[PDB]
């Protein structure tokens, strides 16, 4: 019960059970992994009063793969995390092409979960006295 500032919440593809009248929830590291799935699945203007939430990775569809592109991809990913996921620090972004013919680009993101609580983390019994900005 030491790791209570990562928090608890709804699972992303919310599932409803009938063996008990409840919706499944996630916590800790599991919760972090689903947060990342949400962020990179939504476009910048799709939320109603949150006009700047999501990412622009679609800009790179139907384009050739080179050094300039790879630099741009890395920048897009890092900024989305700095703005929207306070609980982690990116470690490495590995961008490679696994198919000579099929139009595939493979991106592997590795990251580290923070041991100390961020000033941007809105978890209920903490942000009240620790959420300065």
């Amino acid at each position: 019960k030491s790791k209570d500032f990562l928090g608890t919440g709804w699972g992303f593809p919310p599932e409803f059970e009938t063996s008990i009248g409840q919706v499944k929830t996630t916590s800790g590291v599991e919760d972090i992994q689903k947060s990342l799935e949400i962020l990179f699945s939504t476009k910048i203007g799709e939320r109603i009063m949150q006009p700047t939430y999501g990412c622009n990775l679609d800009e790179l569809l139907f384009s050739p793969i080179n050094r300039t592109l790879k630099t741009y991809v890395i920048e897009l990913i890092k900024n989305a995390i700095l703005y929207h996921e306070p609980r982690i620090d990116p470690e490495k972004i590995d961008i490679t092409q696994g198919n000579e013919i099929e139009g595939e680009l493979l991106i592997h993101l590795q990251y580290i979960v923070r041991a100390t609580n961020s000033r941007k983390n809105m978890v209920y019994p903490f942000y009240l006295e620790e959420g300065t900005n």
Partner: protein, 549 residues
Amino acid sequence: TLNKHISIPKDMSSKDDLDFHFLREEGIRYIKELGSNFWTDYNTHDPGITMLEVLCYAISDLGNRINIPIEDLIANEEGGVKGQFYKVQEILPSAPTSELDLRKLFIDIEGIKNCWIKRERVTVFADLKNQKLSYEKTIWEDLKENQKAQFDLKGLYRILVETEDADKVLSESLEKAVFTKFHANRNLCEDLIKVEKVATEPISVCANVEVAPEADEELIHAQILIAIEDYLAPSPRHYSLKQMVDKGYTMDEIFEGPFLENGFIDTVELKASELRKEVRLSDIINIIMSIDGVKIVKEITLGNCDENDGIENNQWVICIPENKKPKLCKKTTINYFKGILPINLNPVRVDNHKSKILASRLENDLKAKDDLEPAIPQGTFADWGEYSSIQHEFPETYGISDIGLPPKLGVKRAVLARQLKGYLLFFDQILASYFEHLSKIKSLLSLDQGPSFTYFTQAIKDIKDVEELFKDPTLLENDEELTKSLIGKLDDTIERRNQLMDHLIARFAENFSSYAFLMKFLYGESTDEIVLQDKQSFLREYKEISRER
């Protein structure tokens, strides 16, 4: 009941046993005052100073456990407070000896709504010429006027019972219940003669009542009718503990009388529900006028219900004989009007309203049966006397730790390490005693049975060679033998045990001082053991002793 944010204070200064820096400074001050002629180097490489800091650390640990809350320090392994305290359900209630207590006692027999307690006057007549007495006035035949006497008896009872059944007599099962409880719980020099059903007096009420043009007459009738019946013969209701608390009563008051299994009974209501002596129109009118929808009572009258009820006085107040309960005569009636037109009521609709109004009262009396007691805070249990040797706080260089000392350093250094372990045991045995003493608080203040010793010690076994350091290792296998050997006589058990017992006895406002000398007429030196045994027995048996007087 929400979670709060948790933080730690920044002013770490208390000037007491929990303040490390404070203790360290005092330590050095004492050293200079006592030994500065020989020990002047107080630098940090000094073994002397190193030992002081270790001891200061150990002191803080002890102080920290002393501050653990009582709920945990005296907890039982299985929970509860059986041998420590008597609970309110057990120590506050009193046997029933008053008139109100008796009414509360019997009113809880199922089927009984109310009870009244009256006194019998049995008369005995006597012949003062020839001292002789009899229940007959025949005892006075042939005597002069100044040779006669009468005395009345002083402690006999009659119980008047009002039941739910509305039958002519009491069920024999009620008579058995009342007699059983009376005899089981009675005062010295008092007795019960008869249990019987309360007598009644019938009263008529007749009226013409105008109601609002938009009003439910069947409901108005059911409401007026109930309210008049309650005026004539009120009864108390049972309450939950939560409700008694909401009313503003405290613990001393809630538990003042006999404990009742069916819920609490409010003394005010009980006093109010006495047999009525007078009935009057000024109250009956107010009952009717207060019912929502009633506008005008155009005609109203009371009267003793009787036959040939022709022209008679208004009877503005009707008086009731001394042992009767008033009851509506069922020849009563109310004519309802709207404007100038009479309206008709249906019996089935009225019965339904009356039933609902009263049935909802039963529901509350039943709910009152569950909430009969307050909560008690509960702690945990965790061997509060656990102790670790201070020898584990030193560096490896000293050689008194678990990994030992490397062979290449020679025998002499290994020997010197042994000498230091010996010295340090003088500090550990004392600290171990204090921790051990916390583990015994429960016994020292026990209501079931206290210990034979008042001071305690422990074997220390987290030191690798204690089997060689001690001349006789046997003692390390049994803390009771170790106590007798190390503390021994210093523990003046007879005087200390008496002081503890006297304190506990005093908490109940009792006093055993006279045993100090009365027992010397029976026993010699052996009285000290006898008296302590008797004092412990007294505390164990106290719950009944103070109650069933």
